């Protein structure tokens, strides 16, 4: 009974494009990029009232965030950046902005056919991560 209902469920990574370079731009070192780049994370999205929870389990790291749309929160990312995060819903698309050390990256999640498509942008580096229902 929510707009994020399209996103609710368990999703598994099925394809990746340009992710190594996105990780490099975000400050991930060589060894961490090599290991992290092998991973096939899941994405588990749930809603309880106004609280949205996004969990990611993988060999690299398990993470979990809970948030209210529009409200900034602290996040420690899978690659150990300590960031200030705001997530909003803009015309059906979940838009996640992460700010740290004067830098910023945007991760958008959208439903496209049976897929959940994730676009990751840092400066002029864009990566696409495609998920399907688990
Ligand atoms: C882009 C999305 C939404 C998550 C995320 O925050 N990923 C990362 C972002 C920066 C650095 C590393 C990762 C990462 C790499 C491997 C495994 C887990 C996280 C999902 C993903 O599909 O990777
Ligand atoms: Cl590193
Ligand atoms: Cl872990």
């Amino acid at each position: 009974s929510h707009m994020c209902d399209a996103f609710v469920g368990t999703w598994k990574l099925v394809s990746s494009e340009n992710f190594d370079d996105y990780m490099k731009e975000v400050g991930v070192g060589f060894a961490t990029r090599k290991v992290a780049g092998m991973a096939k994370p899941n994405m588990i999205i749930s809603v309880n009232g106004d609280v949205i929870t996004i969990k990611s389990e993988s060999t690299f790291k398990n993470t979990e965030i809970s948030f209210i749309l529009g409200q900034e929160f602290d996040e420690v990312t899978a690659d150990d950046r300590k960031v200030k995060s705001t997530i909003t819903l803009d015309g059906g698309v979940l838009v996640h902005v992460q700010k740290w050390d004067g830098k910023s990256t945007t991760i958008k999640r959208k439903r496209e056919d049976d897929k959940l498509v994730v676009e990751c942008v840092m400066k002029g580096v864009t990566s696409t991560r495609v998920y399907e229902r688990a």
Side-chain angles (χ1 to χ4, degrees):
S1 61
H2 193 268
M3 201 54 204
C4 290
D5 274 12
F7 297 102
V8 163
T10 297
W11 303 88
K12 53 172 177 50
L13 186 73
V14 291
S15 83
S16 182
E17 211 183 67
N18 306 281
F19 194 65
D20 182 77
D21 277 2
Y22 170 77
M23 285 192 286
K24 191 157 181 176
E25 203 80 352
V26 168
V28 188
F30 174 93
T32 296
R33 282 210 316 285
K34 298 293 101 181
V35 170
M38 298 299 292
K40 306 290 176 173
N42 76 2
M43 192 190 297
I44 307 185
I45 298 183
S46 60
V47 179
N48 182 329
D50 296 331
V51 184
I52 304 158
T53 295
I54 303 175
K55 191 180 323 177
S56 177
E57 305 157 353
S58 71
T59 62
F60 174 59
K61 196 93 177 66
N62 299 326
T63 65
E64 180 171 358
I65 55 176
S66 294
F67 58 90
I68 296 179
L69 294 161
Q71 299 197 350
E72 186 183 77
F73 59 101
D74 296 310
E75 181 185 2
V76 177
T77 65
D79 63 307
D80 247 303
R81 290 171 288 129
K82 290 68 177 158
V83 314
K84 296 283 191 176
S85 288
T86 309
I87 298 170
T88 55
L89 192 60
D90 298 332
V93 184
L94 285 168
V95 178
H96 179 176
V97 182
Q98 293 173 342
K99 311 277 201 199
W100 80 106
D101 302 344
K103 307 154 191 178
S104 181
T105 191
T106 301
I107 298 178
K108 300 176 180 186
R109 294 164 169 90
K110 80 170 206 176
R111 283 296 313 273
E112 189 187 280
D113 298 324
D114 281 329
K115 295 152 188 171
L116 188 154
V117 179
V118 186
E119 177 200 60
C120 301
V121 173
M122 175 65 175
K123 315 293 211 221
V125 180
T126 301
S127 175
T128 305
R129 298 278 267 189
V130 181
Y131 286 76
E132 279 168 8
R133 281 193 196 280

